[PDB]
Amino acid sequence: PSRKFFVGGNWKMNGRKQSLGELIGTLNAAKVPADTEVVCAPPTAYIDFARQKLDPKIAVAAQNCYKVTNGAFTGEISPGMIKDCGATWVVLGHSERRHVFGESDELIGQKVAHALAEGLRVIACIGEKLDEREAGITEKVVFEQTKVIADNVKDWSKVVLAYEPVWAIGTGKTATPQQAQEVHEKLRGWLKSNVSDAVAQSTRIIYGGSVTGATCKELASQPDVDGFLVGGASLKPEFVDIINAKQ
Amino acid sequence: SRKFFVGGNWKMNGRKQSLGELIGTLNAAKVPADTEVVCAPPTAYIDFARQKLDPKIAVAAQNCYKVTNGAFTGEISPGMIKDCGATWVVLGHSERRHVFGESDELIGQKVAHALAEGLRVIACIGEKLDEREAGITEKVVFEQTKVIADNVKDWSKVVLAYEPVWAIGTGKTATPQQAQEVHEKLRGWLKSNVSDAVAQSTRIIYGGSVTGATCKELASQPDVDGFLVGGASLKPEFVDIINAKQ
């Protein structure tokens, strides 16, 4: 075994063909350690574009999808369309989906089951808000979120778990590497007693809080932090430094 | 002399192979000179569809968000839509409103941002069955129209689409006369609340069930200026609907 280090770049709702072309040019030229698995999530308008321009060494993810293959869902896309555009991953349950756009755990679990049935790999996102953390219910929230995902997973070899400390995002608060490690350790424990030891040992649990070229090595060194889901830094050459966080 | 307007809402349907085939048909299709045609592909295929479609057909996004760039995983902006060559966006579609919970407040903000950024807007309104049977059809669609109107300065850039949401899988359906009556009311609203010139020049398209068999009678209604077509938009039948005035 030994868990392959995993770096996802979530571009969110940023970029146009020219600017993303330049970003992609920089990534294509960058040294990608073979020990690292890199995945970029473009805006949904540019999934096809990104896959055409990006070197095969980098995988492409959709930022969201829906839970059936086709239907009367104006504004949505399905896993079949994601695969048809050459992407192999989808991000599900991202904090912005949950807390800006109100996606339920129930919906999120249905999307996970559908995406996996359709042959996609999934970066499944969980995390607690500031009120939840300050109420002492971090474990309750993240465990129930993880439970719904697990209920809808049959092959954990296709899943990466991303912990987003939403309490430390846009709140003025910040999370230390020990605090991150603490959640990741709890999460791996959860997997061990609720799914299997094999699943606990093999599953990447990546950190989706604030990470830079300056903080990434210390965070990556944490024994249960298996890499990153990067936000704003994924749009900057510094993403390369995060890819090289274990070098 | 309102140009007849036929929009095809593909919704979440198709792949490159099947949509390429559909596009080949539409490219070969003789479109009437008095008719403006727009197709709204799934978001993953806006770029693809614009590249394959002939310039006689415009391309619309099915939705957008309300800022140019930002931390909104899973969203796209008007600037992205334009960057892919599309010139329209569909906003306030019944599925966004009633499956995904988009408020009037959000929809109006989207309309303003889309228009400010240079897109043309197909802005959708309509009442559910409960509202219709409570007698509040006019109330519902006038208020939805008002929120849209509040965020529109150039009406040459918008098309209004009435969606009888009350007729979707409910056990009721809309007659051509029931369509025409709400369309007539809406045009009167534009006259009363905007201008006579806006009332006369704005397309109000019908977004309920339409087929090749039914389009000519619906298009003949004096206040129905075209269609926002669902299922039929994925088939050559869509061309019959483009031809509804001929």
Coordinates of C-alpha atoms in Angstrom, one line a residue:
Chain A
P1 CA 0.0 0.0 0.0
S2 CA 1.3 3.6 0.9
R3 CA -1.2 6.3 -0.1
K4 CA -0.3 8.2 -3.3
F5 CA 0.0 12.0 -2.6
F6 CA -3.0 13.8 -4.1
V7 CA -3.2 17.5 -5.2
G8 CA -6.5 18.9 -6.6
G9 CA -6.8 22.4 -8.0
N10 CA -10.3 23.9 -7.8
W11 CA -10.3 26.9 -10.2
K12 CA -13.9 27.6 -9.0
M13 CA -15.6 30.3 -11.1
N14 CA -12.5 31.9 -12.5
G15 CA -10.8 32.3 -15.9
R16 CA -11.4 32.6 -19.6
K17 CA -9.9 30.6 -22.4
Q18 CA -6.8 32.9 -22.7
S19 CA -6.0 33.2 -19.0
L20 CA -6.7 29.5 -18.4
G21 CA -4.5 28.7 -21.5
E22 CA -1.6 30.5 -19.8
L23 CA -2.3 28.7 -16.5
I24 CA -2.4 25.4 -18.4
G25 CA 0.8 26.2 -20.2
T26 CA 2.6 26.7 -16.9
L27 CA 1.2 23.4 -15.5
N28 CA 2.2 21.5 -18.7
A29 CA 5.8 22.7 -18.3
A30 CA 5.9 22.0 -14.6
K31 CA 7.8 19.1 -13.0
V32 CA 5.2 16.6 -11.8
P33 CA 6.7 14.1 -9.4
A34 CA 5.5 10.6 -10.3
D35 CA 4.7 10.0 -6.6
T36 CA 2.0 12.8 -7.0
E37 CA -1.6 12.5 -8.5
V38 CA -2.7 16.0 -9.9
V39 CA -6.3 16.9 -10.8
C40 CA -7.6 20.2 -12.0
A41 CA -11.3 21.3 -11.8
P42 CA -12.1 24.0 -14.4
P43 CA -15.3 26.0 -14.7
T44 CA -18.0 23.8 -16.3
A45 CA -17.9 25.8 -19.6
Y46 CA -14.2 24.8 -19.9
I47 CA -14.1 21.1 -19.0
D48 CA -13.6 20.1 -22.6
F49 CA -11.2 23.0 -23.3
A50 CA -9.1 22.2 -20.3
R51 CA -8.8 18.5 -21.2
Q52 CA -7.8 19.3 -24.7
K53 CA -5.0 21.7 -23.6
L54 CA -3.8 19.9 -20.4
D55 CA -1.0 17.2 -20.6
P56 CA -2.4 13.7 -20.0
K57 CA -0.3 13.7 -16.8
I58 CA -2.9 16.0 -15.2
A59 CA -6.5 14.6 -14.8
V60 CA -9.6 16.8 -15.3
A61 CA -12.5 17.1 -12.8
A62 CA -15.9 18.6 -13.0
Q63 CA -16.8 21.0 -10.1
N64 CA -20.3 19.4 -9.7
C65 CA -22.8 17.1 -11.4
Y66 CA -26.3 15.9 -11.0
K67 CA -27.7 12.4 -10.1
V68 CA -29.2 11.0 -13.2
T69 CA -27.8 10.4 -16.6
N70 CA -30.2 12.7 -18.6
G71 CA -33.3 14.6 -17.8
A72 CA -35.3 17.8 -17.3
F73 CA -32.7 19.6 -15.2
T74 CA -32.0 22.9 -17.0
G75 CA -28.5 24.1 -15.9
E76 CA -27.1 20.8 -14.8
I77 CA -24.6 18.3 -16.2
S78 CA -24.4 14.5 -15.7
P79 CA -21.4 12.2 -15.2
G80 CA -21.9 10.8 -18.7
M81 CA -21.3 14.3 -20.1
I82 CA -18.2 14.8 -17.9
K83 CA -16.7 11.5 -19.2
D84 CA -17.8 12.3 -22.8
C85 CA -15.6 15.5 -22.4
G86 CA -12.6 13.4 -21.3
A87 CA -12.8 14.3 -17.6
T88 CA -12.3 11.4 -15.1
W89 CA -13.2 13.1 -11.8
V90 CA -16.0 15.1 -10.2
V91 CA -15.9 17.2 -7.0
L92 CA -19.1 16.6 -4.9
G93 CA -20.3 18.3 -1.8
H94 CA -18.0 21.3 -2.0
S95 CA -18.6 23.8 0.8
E96 CA -19.9 26.3 -1.7
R97 CA -22.5 23.8 -3.0
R98 CA -23.6 23.0 0.5
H99 CA -23.6 26.5 2.1
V100 CA -24.2 28.9 -0.8
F101 CA -26.4 26.7 -3.0
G102 CA -28.0 24.6 -0.3
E103 CA -27.2 21.1 -1.5
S104 CA -28.3 18.5 1.1
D105 CA -26.4 15.5 2.3
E106 CA -29.2 13.4 0.8
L107 CA -28.7 15.0 -2.7
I108 CA -24.9 14.8 -2.3
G109 CA -25.1 11.0 -1.5
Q110 CA -27.3 10.4 -4.6
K111 CA -24.8 12.3 -6.7
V112 CA -21.9 10.2 -5.3
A113 CA -23.7 6.9 -6.1
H114 CA -24.5 8.0 -9.6
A115 CA -21.1 9.4 -10.4
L116 CA -19.4 6.2 -9.2
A117 CA -21.8 3.9 -11.0
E118 CA -21.0 5.9 -14.2
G119 CA -17.3 5.4 -13.9
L120 CA -16.1 8.7 -12.5
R121 CA -13.8 9.2 -9.5
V122 CA -15.0 11.5 -6.8
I123 CA -13.5 14.1 -4.6
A124 CA -16.1 14.1 -1.8
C125 CA -16.0 17.2 0.4
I126 CA -17.0 17.5 4.1
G127 CA -16.5 20.1 6.8
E128 CA -18.0 22.0 9.7
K129 CA -18.9 25.7 10.0
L130 CA -17.7 28.0 12.8
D131 CA -21.0 27.8 14.9
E132 CA -20.8 24.0 14.7
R133 CA -17.1 23.9 15.8
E134 CA -17.7 26.3 18.7
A135 CA -20.7 24.1 19.7
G136 CA -18.3 21.2 20.1
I137 CA -19.9 19.2 17.3
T138 CA -17.1 19.0 14.7
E139 CA -17.0 15.2 14.9
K140 CA -20.8 14.8 14.8
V141 CA -21.1 17.0 11.6
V142 CA -18.1 15.6 9.8
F143 CA -19.0 12.0 10.7
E144 CA -22.6 12.2 9.6
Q145 CA -21.4 13.9 6.3
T146 CA -18.9 11.1 5.8
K147 CA -21.5 8.5 6.7
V148 CA -23.9 9.6 3.9
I149 CA -21.0 9.5 1.4
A150 CA -19.9 6.1 2.6
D151 CA -23.5 4.8 2.3
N152 CA -23.2 5.6 -1.4
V153 CA -19.7 4.2 -2.1
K154 CA -19.0 0.7 -3.3
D155 CA -15.4 1.2 -4.5
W156 CA -13.3 3.4 -2.3
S157 CA -10.4 3.0 -4.8
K158 CA -12.3 5.7 -6.8
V159 CA -12.8 8.2 -3.9
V160 CA -10.8 10.9 -2.2
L161 CA -12.1 12.5 0.9
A162 CA -11.5 16.3 1.3
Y163 CA -11.9 18.0 4.6
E164 CA -12.7 21.7 4.3
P165 CA -12.5 23.6 7.6
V166 CA -15.3 25.9 6.7
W167 CA -15.0 27.5 10.2
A168 CA -11.6 28.7 9.1
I169 CA -12.7 30.0 5.7
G170 CA -13.7 33.7 5.5
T171 CA -14.4 33.9 9.2
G172 CA -11.2 35.6 10.5
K173 CA -10.3 32.2 12.2
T174 CA -7.4 30.0 11.0
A175 CA -6.6 26.3 11.4
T176 CA -3.2 25.0 12.5
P177 CA -1.6 21.9 11.0
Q178 CA -2.2 20.0 14.3
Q179 CA -5.9 21.0 14.1
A180 CA -6.1 19.7 10.5
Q181 CA -4.3 16.5 11.5
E182 CA -6.7 16.0 14.3
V183 CA -9.7 16.0 12.0
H184 CA -8.0 13.8 9.5
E185 CA -7.1 11.3 12.2
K186 CA -10.7 11.2 13.5
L187 CA -11.9 10.7 9.9
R188 CA -9.5 7.8 9.3
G189 CA -10.7 6.2 12.5
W190 CA -14.2 6.7 11.4
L191 CA -13.5 4.8 8.2
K192 CA -11.8 1.9 10.0
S193 CA -14.7 1.1 12.4
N194 CA -17.5 1.9 10.0
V195 CA -16.2 0.5 6.6
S196 CA -13.0 -1.5 6.9
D197 CA -9.4 -1.3 7.9
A198 CA -8.4 -1.7 4.3
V199 CA -10.5 1.4 3.3
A200 CA -9.0 3.4 6.2
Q201 CA -5.4 2.6 5.2
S202 CA -5.8 3.1 1.5
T203 CA -8.1 6.2 1.3
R204 CA -6.6 9.7 0.6
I205 CA -7.9 12.2 3.0
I206 CA -6.9 15.6 1.6
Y207 CA -7.0 19.0 3.3
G208 CA -9.1 21.8 1.8
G209 CA -8.3 24.7 4.1
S210 CA -5.9 27.5 3.4
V211 CA -2.6 26.2 1.9
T212 CA 0.3 28.1 0.3
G213 CA 3.8 27.4 -1.0
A214 CA 4.9 28.5 2.5
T215 CA 2.6 26.2 4.6
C216 CA 2.2 23.2 2.3
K217 CA 5.3 21.1 3.5
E218 CA 4.4 21.2 7.1
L219 CA 0.7 20.3 6.3
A220 CA 1.8 17.5 4.0
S221 CA 4.1 16.1 6.7
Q222 CA 1.1 15.4 8.9
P223 CA 0.7 11.6 9.0
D224 CA -3.1 11.6 8.1
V225 CA -3.0 14.5 5.6
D226 CA -2.6 12.9 2.1
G227 CA -2.6 16.1 0.1
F228 CA -4.7 19.1 -0.8
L229 CA -7.8 20.5 -2.5
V230 CA -6.5 23.9 -3.4
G231 CA -8.6 27.0 -4.0
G232 CA -7.3 30.3 -5.0
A233 CA -3.6 29.2 -5.1
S234 CA -4.6 26.7 -7.9
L235 CA -4.8 29.6 -10.3
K236 CA -1.2 30.7 -9.6
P237 CA 2.3 29.2 -10.4
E238 CA 2.6 28.5 -6.7
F239 CA 0.3 25.5 -7.3
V240 CA 3.4 23.8 -8.6
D241 CA 5.0 24.3 -5.1
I242 CA 2.0 22.6 -3.6
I243 CA 2.3 19.7 -6.1
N244 CA 6.0 19.4 -4.9
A245 CA 5.0 19.6 -1.1
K246 CA 6.5 16.2 -0.4
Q247 CA 9.7 16.7 -2.4
Chain B
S1 CA -43.3 43.2 -36.6
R2 CA -41.9 41.1 -33.7
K3 CA -39.5 38.7 -35.1
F4 CA -40.8 35.1 -34.4
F5 CA -38.5 33.4 -31.8
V6 CA -37.9 29.7 -31.3
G7 CA -35.5 28.7 -28.5
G8 CA -34.5 25.0 -28.0
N9 CA -33.8 24.1 -24.4
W10 CA -31.9 20.8 -24.5
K11 CA -31.9 20.7 -20.7
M12 CA -29.5 18.0 -19.3
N13 CA -29.6 15.8 -22.4
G14 CA -27.2 14.5 -25.1
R15 CA -23.6 13.8 -25.7
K16 CA -21.2 15.1 -28.4
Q17 CA -22.2 12.3 -30.8
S18 CA -26.0 12.7 -30.5
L19 CA -25.8 16.6 -30.3
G20 CA -23.5 16.7 -33.3
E21 CA -26.1 14.8 -35.2
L22 CA -28.9 17.1 -34.1
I23 CA -26.6 20.1 -35.0
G24 CA -26.0 18.7 -38.5
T25 CA -29.7 18.6 -39.1
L26 CA -30.2 22.2 -37.8
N27 CA -27.3 23.5 -40.0
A28 CA -28.9 21.8 -43.1
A29 CA -32.3 23.2 -42.1
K30 CA -33.8 26.1 -44.1
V31 CA -34.7 28.6 -41.4
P32 CA -37.4 31.3 -42.3
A33 CA -36.2 34.8 -42.8
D34 CA -38.8 36.1 -40.3
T35 CA -37.6 33.8 -37.5
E36 CA -34.8 34.0 -34.9
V37 CA -33.5 30.6 -33.6
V38 CA -31.5 29.9 -30.4
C39 CA -30.3 26.6 -28.9
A40 CA -29.4 26.1 -25.2
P41 CA -27.1 23.2 -24.7
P42 CA -25.9 21.7 -21.5
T43 CA -23.2 23.8 -19.9
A44 CA -20.4 21.3 -20.7
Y45 CA -21.3 21.7 -24.4
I46 CA -21.8 25.4 -24.9
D47 CA -18.3 25.7 -26.5
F48 CA -18.8 22.5 -28.6
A49 CA -22.2 23.5 -29.8
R50 CA -21.1 27.0 -30.8
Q51 CA -18.2 25.5 -32.8
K52 CA -20.4 23.1 -34.7
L53 CA -23.5 25.2 -35.2
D54 CA -24.0 27.5 -38.2
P55 CA -24.0 31.3 -37.4
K56 CA -27.7 31.5 -38.3
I57 CA -28.4 29.8 -35.0
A58 CA -27.5 31.6 -31.7
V59 CA -26.3 29.7 -28.6
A60 CA -27.6 30.2 -25.0
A61 CA -26.3 29.1 -21.7
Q62 CA -29.0 27.4 -19.6
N63 CA -28.2 29.5 -16.5
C64 CA -25.4 31.7 -15.1
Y65 CA -24.3 33.3 -11.8
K66 CA -24.3 37.0 -10.9
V67 CA -20.6 38.0 -10.7
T68 CA -17.9 38.0 -13.2
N69 CA -15.5 35.7 -11.3
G70 CA -15.5 34.2 -7.8
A71 CA -15.5 31.4 -5.2
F72 CA -18.6 29.7 -6.7
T73 CA -17.7 26.1 -7.4
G74 CA -20.0 24.7 -10.1
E75 CA -21.1 28.1 -11.5
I76 CA -20.4 30.0 -14.7
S77 CA -20.4 33.7 -15.4
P78 CA -21.8 35.8 -18.3
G79 CA -18.2 36.6 -19.2
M80 CA -17.4 32.8 -19.6
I81 CA -20.6 32.4 -21.7
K82 CA -19.5 35.2 -24.1
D83 CA -16.0 33.8 -24.1
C84 CA -17.5 30.6 -25.5
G85 CA -19.3 32.5 -28.3
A86 CA -22.8 32.3 -26.9
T87 CA -24.9 35.4 -26.9
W88 CA -27.9 34.4 -24.8
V89 CA -28.6 33.0 -21.3
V90 CA -31.8 31.4 -20.0
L91 CA -32.7 32.7 -16.5
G92 CA -35.6 31.9 -14.1
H93 CA -36.4 28.6 -15.8
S94 CA -39.0 26.6 -13.8
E95 CA -36.5 23.9 -13.0
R96 CA -34.0 26.4 -11.5
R97 CA -36.9 28.0 -9.5
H98 CA -38.7 24.8 -8.4
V99 CA -36.1 22.0 -8.3
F100 CA -33.1 24.1 -7.3
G101 CA -34.8 26.8 -5.2
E102 CA -33.6 30.0 -7.1
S103 CA -35.4 33.0 -5.7
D104 CA -36.8 36.0 -7.5
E105 CA -34.2 38.1 -5.8
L106 CA -31.3 35.9 -7.2
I107 CA -32.9 35.7 -10.6
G108 CA -33.3 39.5 -11.0
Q109 CA -29.7 40.0 -9.9
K110 CA -28.6 37.4 -12.6
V111 CA -30.7 39.3 -15.2
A112 CA -29.0 42.6 -14.4
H113 CA -25.5 41.1 -14.4
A114 CA -26.1 39.2 -17.7
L115 CA -27.4 42.3 -19.4
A116 CA -24.7 44.5 -18.1
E117 CA -22.1 42.1 -19.5
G118 CA -23.7 42.1 -23.0
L119 CA -25.8 38.9 -23.0
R120 CA -29.3 38.7 -24.3
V121 CA -31.8 37.1 -21.8
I122 CA -34.7 34.6 -22.1
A123 CA -36.3 35.3 -18.8
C124 CA -38.8 32.7 -17.6
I125 CA -41.9 33.1 -15.5
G126 CA -44.9 31.0 -14.6
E127 CA -47.3 29.8 -11.9
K128 CA -47.7 26.3 -10.3
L129 CA -51.0 24.4 -10.1
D130 CA -51.8 25.5 -6.5
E131 CA -51.4 29.2 -7.5
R132 CA -53.5 28.8 -10.6
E133 CA -56.3 27.1 -8.6
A134 CA -56.1 29.8 -5.9
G135 CA -56.9 32.4 -8.5
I136 CA -53.5 34.1 -8.3
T137 CA -52.0 33.4 -11.8
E138 CA -51.9 37.1 -12.7
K139 CA -50.4 38.0 -9.3
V140 CA -47.7 35.4 -9.6
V141 CA -46.6 36.1 -13.2
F142 CA -46.9 39.9 -12.9
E143 CA -44.6 40.0 -9.8
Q144 CA -42.1 37.7 -11.5
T145 CA -42.2 39.9 -14.6
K146 CA -41.7 43.0 -12.4
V147 CA -38.5 41.6 -10.8
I148 CA -37.2 40.9 -14.3
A149 CA -38.4 44.4 -15.5
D150 CA -36.6 46.1 -12.6
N151 CA -33.3 44.7 -13.9
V152 CA -33.9 45.4 -17.6
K153 CA -32.9 48.7 -19.3
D154 CA -32.8 47.6 -22.9
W155 CA -35.8 45.4 -23.8
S156 CA -34.4 44.8 -27.2
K157 CA -32.1 42.3 -25.4
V158 CA -34.8 40.2 -23.7
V159 CA -37.4 37.7 -24.6
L160 CA -40.0 36.7 -22.0
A161 CA -41.1 33.1 -21.7
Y162 CA -44.3 32.0 -20.0
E163 CA -44.1 28.5 -18.5
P164 CA -47.4 27.0 -17.4
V165 CA -45.7 25.1 -14.6
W166 CA -49.2 23.9 -13.4
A167 CA -49.4 21.7 -16.6
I168 CA -46.1 19.7 -15.9
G169 CA -47.0 16.2 -14.9
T170 CA -50.0 17.4 -12.9
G171 CA -53.0 16.0 -14.8
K172 CA -53.9 19.3 -16.3
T173 CA -52.7 20.8 -19.6
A174 CA -52.9 24.2 -21.2
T175 CA -55.1 25.0 -24.2
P176 CA -54.0 27.5 -26.8
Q177 CA -56.6 29.9 -25.4
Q178 CA -55.3 29.5 -21.9
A179 CA -51.8 30.3 -23.3
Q180 CA -53.0 33.3 -25.3
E181 CA -54.8 34.8 -22.3
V182 CA -51.8 35.0 -20.0
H183 CA -49.6 36.2 -22.9
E184 CA -52.2 39.0 -23.6
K185 CA -52.1 39.9 -19.9
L186 CA -48.3 40.0 -19.9
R187 CA -48.1 42.3 -22.9
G188 CA -50.7 44.6 -21.3
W189 CA -48.4 44.6 -18.2
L190 CA -45.4 45.8 -20.3
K191 CA -47.6 48.5 -21.8
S192 CA -48.9 49.6 -18.4
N193 CA -45.6 49.4 -16.5
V194 CA -42.9 50.1 -19.2
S195 CA -44.1 51.5 -22.5
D196 CA -46.4 50.8 -25.3
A197 CA -43.3 50.6 -27.6
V198 CA -41.9 47.8 -25.3
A199 CA -45.2 46.0 -25.2
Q200 CA -45.4 46.0 -29.0
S201 CA -41.7 45.1 -29.7
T202 CA -41.0 42.5 -26.9
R203 CA -41.4 38.8 -27.9
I204 CA -43.4 36.8 -25.3
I205 CA -42.8 33.2 -26.1
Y206 CA -44.7 30.1 -24.9
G207 CA -42.7 27.7 -22.8
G208 CA -45.4 25.0 -22.2
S209 CA -45.8 21.8 -24.2
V210 CA -45.4 22.3 -27.9
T211 CA -44.9 19.8 -30.7
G212 CA -44.9 19.8 -34.5
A213 CA -48.6 18.9 -34.4
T214 CA -49.5 21.7 -32.1
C215 CA -47.1 24.6 -33.0
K216 CA -49.1 26.2 -35.8
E217 CA -52.2 26.8 -33.7
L218 CA -50.2 28.1 -30.8
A219 CA -48.1 30.4 -33.1
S220 CA -51.3 31.7 -34.7
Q221 CA -52.4 33.2 -31.2
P222 CA -51.9 37.0 -31.6
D223 CA -49.9 37.5 -28.4
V224 CA -47.7 34.3 -28.7
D225 CA -44.4 35.3 -30.4
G226 CA -42.8 31.9 -30.4
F227 CA -41.6 29.1 -28.1
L228 CA -39.1 27.9 -25.5
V229 CA -39.2 24.3 -26.6
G230 CA -38.3 21.3 -24.3
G231 CA -38.2 17.7 -25.6
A232 CA -39.0 18.5 -29.2
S233 CA -35.8 20.6 -29.4
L234 CA -33.7 17.4 -29.4
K235 CA -35.3 16.1 -32.6
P236 CA -35.8 17.2 -36.3
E237 CA -39.3 18.1 -35.2
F238 CA -37.8 21.2 -33.8
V239 CA -37.5 22.5 -37.4
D240 CA -41.3 22.1 -37.8
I241 CA -41.6 24.4 -34.8
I242 CA -39.2 26.9 -36.4
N243 CA -41.5 26.7 -39.4
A244 CA -44.7 27.3 -37.3
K245 CA -45.5 30.6 -39.0
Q246 CA -45.0 29.3 -42.6

